[PDB]
């Protein structure tokens, strides 16, 4: 078998797997299957420049025919709503080739949107129309004494998510399915852990973002939303194409990608056009499970399934917090830092740079190709007697034969140390060709007893 450490890594890497199986009695849909689902109406704005340029107006007066809509008193968006709306608009433009410019409809634009409030509850909390309808571009928001959610939209609250959700609808995204409850969902991932378009909470799929009496809602497009809107309009590869840090010490310049306190409730899906990026969750004290796999989910900031990387995005670095975290790299050369606590770090393929941080850290290797002589990982702060290099996924617990020189026998391993440069190394000849086919270098001495195999 393998160690528990490896099993924890493997289990997490597969924890949110989607497609080809039932979950909650419903088919599990992959991101692409949901992208189709969310765009099943066939409505979209049309381009051309290969970009959809929309204009939008915060209506200052009721349109012609307004009174017939049964919405009651019309009112213009407040400055706060306009500010939040713009942030919501921006979060969509960030991921797909659609732009929103405040202004009147213009012959040069691909469509025009309108935003406004109404006071009669009968109109519903908020609503919008698909771009193929006669009321294309419109979204309306209820505000009255009995319903105040839309009066103060803000990062993380439902008021902001409503703006995001309604704009998504005006862009052509349908709600995930047609006294309905999650039981009526067409697919398993129809919850707001995967899409802001969903009516159902993340609890239905097992994620935990918050507790009773508190609201926690992604302010920006989530994993499936991004897939859906890019399917419609193409991915916007221009955004944050330089190096970007998301989370703590964020350089993403987006309120929803920023954490400044251990109590922050991050719920976001990372879209990025390139560069050398980092998910920095160093400010959290809770156990985290960070997955750098494209399209995968992470448990961040004491919550679960709240962070994800959009399909097509390569995130290279991760920094855990003070909790006992799991860090899973991808094929790229990753820099993974555990932070305090007892972490389990899995670099994956490519030559990685691993920092255990303080605590007792375990560096897991699941395949020889994870760390070869020509592309070796380096553990920058290995602490013998406390840290561990775990090769059980490879050796299946068969053990290693620690020698001073490869004898041509498979399983032979060599622990070396270079006192002058405080550099250590673990070489292994798994295949038994008489030469190392696996290599891990360290800063700090490694002893045979620090190896789990």
Known binding-site residues for Ca(2+) equal 47, 49, 51, 53, 110, 240, 242, 244, 272, 274-275, 277, 314, 316, 321, 323, 325, 330, 332, 334, 338-341, 343, 347-350, 352, 356-359, 361, 370, 377, 387
Distance separating alpha carbons of residues 340 and 288, to the nearest angstrom:
12
To Ca ion, the closest distance from the beta carbon of 207 in angstroms equals 21
Among 325, 387, 390, 412, binds Ca ion (CB under 5 A): 325
Which residues, numbered 158-217, are part of the site for Ca ion (CB under 5 A)?
Answer: none
With binding defined as CB under 5 A, does residue 348 bind Ca ion?
yes
Closer to Ca ion at the Cβ: 116 or 351? 351
Closer to Ca ion at the Cβ: 6 or 74? 6
Q: What is the DSSP pairing of strand 451-452 with strand 388-390?
A: parallel
Q: What are phi and psi of 74, to 5 degrees?
A: -80, 145
Count Cβ atoms below 10 Å from residue 407 Cβ, excluding itself: 12
Q: Where does this chain touch Ca ion (CB under 5 A) — which range of 226-234, 243-251, 253-261, 396-404?
A: 243-251
Residue numbers belonging to the annotated binding site for Zn(2+): 165-166, 169, 175
Among 361, 387, 429, 450, binds Ca ion (CB under 5 A): 361
Among 94, 138, 264, 370, binds Ca ion (CB under 5 A): 370
Among 137, 156, 329, 424, binds Ca ion (CB under 5 A): 329
Closer to Ca ion at the Cβ: 201 or 314? 314
With binding defined as CB under 5 A, does residue 387 bind Ca ion?
no
Closer to Ca ion at the Cβ: 184 or 238? 238
Q: Pseudo-torsion of CA 337, 338, 339, 342, nearest 10°? A: -160
Q: H or E segment at 95?
A: helix 79-95
With binding defined as CB under 5 A, does residue 357 bind Ca ion?
yes
3-state SS string for 258-312? EECCCCCCCCEEECCCCCCCEEECCCCCCCCEEECCCCCEEECCCCCCCEEECCC
| Contact map string, positions 266 to 295, toward Ca ion, x by CB under 5 A | ------x--x-x------------------
Closer to Ca ion at the Cβ: 113 or 279? 279
Distance separating alpha carbons of residues 339 and 320, to the nearest angstrom:
6
Give the bridge partners for 258, in sequence order: 247
With binding defined as CB under 5 A, does residue 388 bind Ca ion?
no
Q: H or E segment at 38?
A: helix 31-38
With binding defined as CB under 5 A, does residue 347 bind Ca ion?
yes
Count Cβ atoms below 10 Å from residue 395 Cβ, excluding itself: 20
Structure tokens at 101: 């410019």
> Which string of DSSP letters, residue by residue, matches 20-65?
SSEETTEE---HHHHHHHHTTT--------SSEEEEEEE-SSPPTT
Cβ burial 172-191 (10 Å sphere, 16+ → b, else e): bbbebbeeeebeebebbbbb
- 166 part of the active site: yes
With binding defined as CB under 5 A, does residue 341 bind Ca ion?
yes
With binding defined as CB under 5 A, does residue 339 bind Ca ion?
yes
Structure tokens at 217: 């809602």
Distance separating alpha carbons of residues 103 and 111, to the nearest angstrom:
11
Among 377, 412, 429, 450, binds Ca ion (CB under 5 A): 377
Give the bridge partners for 375, in sequence order: 372
One of 83, 138, 155, 166 is an active-site residue; which one?
166
> Where in the sequence numbering do the catalytic residues fall?
166
Binding residues for Ca ion, per CB under 5 A? 240, 244, 272, 275, 277, 314, 320, 325, 329, 334, 338-339, 341, 343, 347-348, 350, 352, 356-357, 359, 361, 370-371, 377
């Amino acid at each position: 078998g393998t160690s528990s450490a490896f099993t924890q890594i493997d289990n997490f890497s597969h924890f949110y797997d989607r497609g080809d199986h039932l979950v909650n009695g419903k088919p599990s849909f992959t991101v692409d299957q949901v992208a189709d689902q969310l765009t099943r109406s066939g409505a979209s704005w049309h381009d051309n420049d290969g970009v959809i340029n929309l204009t939008y107006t915060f209506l200052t007066a009721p349109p012609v025919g307004y009174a017939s809509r049964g919405l009651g008193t019309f009112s213009q968006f407040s400055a706060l709503q306009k500010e939040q709306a713009k942030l919501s608009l921006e979060s969509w433009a960030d991921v797909a080739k659609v732009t929103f410019t405040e202004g009147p409809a213009a012959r040069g634009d691909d469509g025009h949107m309108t935003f406004a409030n109404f006071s009669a509850s009968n109109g519903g909390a908020a609503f919008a129309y698909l771009p193929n309808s006669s009321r294309k571009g419109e979204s309306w928001y209820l505000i009255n004494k009995d319903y105040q959610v839309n009066k103060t939209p803000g990062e993380g609250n439902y008021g902001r998510q409503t703006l995001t959700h309604e704009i998504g609808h005006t862009l052509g995204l349908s709600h995930p399915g047609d006294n309905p409850t999650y039981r009526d969902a067409v697919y398993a991932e129809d919850t707001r852990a995967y899409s802001v378009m969903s009516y159902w909470s993340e609890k239905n799929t097992g994620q935990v973002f918050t507790k009773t009496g508190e609201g926690a809602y992604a302010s920006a497009p989530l994993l499936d939303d991004i897939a859906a809107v890019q399917k419609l309009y193409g991915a916007n590869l221009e955004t944050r194409a330089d190096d970007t840090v998301y989370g703590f010490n964020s350089t993403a310049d987006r309120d929803f990608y920023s954490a400044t306190s251990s109590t922050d409730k991050l719920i976001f899906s990372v879209w990025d056009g390139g560069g050398n990026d980092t998910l920095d969750f160093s400010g959290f004290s809770q156990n985290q499970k960070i997955n750098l796999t494209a399209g995968s989910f992470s448990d961040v900031g004491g919550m679960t399934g709240n962070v994800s990387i959009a399909q097509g995005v390569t995130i290279e670095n991760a920094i855990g917090g003070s909790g006992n975290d799991l860090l899973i790299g991808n094929d790229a050369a990753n820099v993974l830092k555990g932070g305090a606590g007892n972490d389990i770090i899995y670099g994956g393929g490519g030559a990685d740079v691993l920092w255990g941080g303080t605590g007792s850290d375990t560096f897991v290797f699941g395949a020889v190709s994870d760390s070869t002589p020509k592309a070796a990982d380096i553990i920058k702060d290995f602490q013998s007697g406390f840290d561990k290099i775990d090769l059980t996924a490879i050796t299946k617990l068969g053990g290693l034969n620690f020698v001073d020189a490869f004898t041509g026998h498979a399983g032979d391993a060599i622990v070396s140390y270079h006192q002058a440069s405080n550099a250590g190394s673990l070489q292994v000849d798994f295949s038994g060709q008489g030469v190392a086919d696996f290599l891990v270098t360290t800063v700090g001495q490694v002893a045979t007893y620090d190896i789990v195999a």
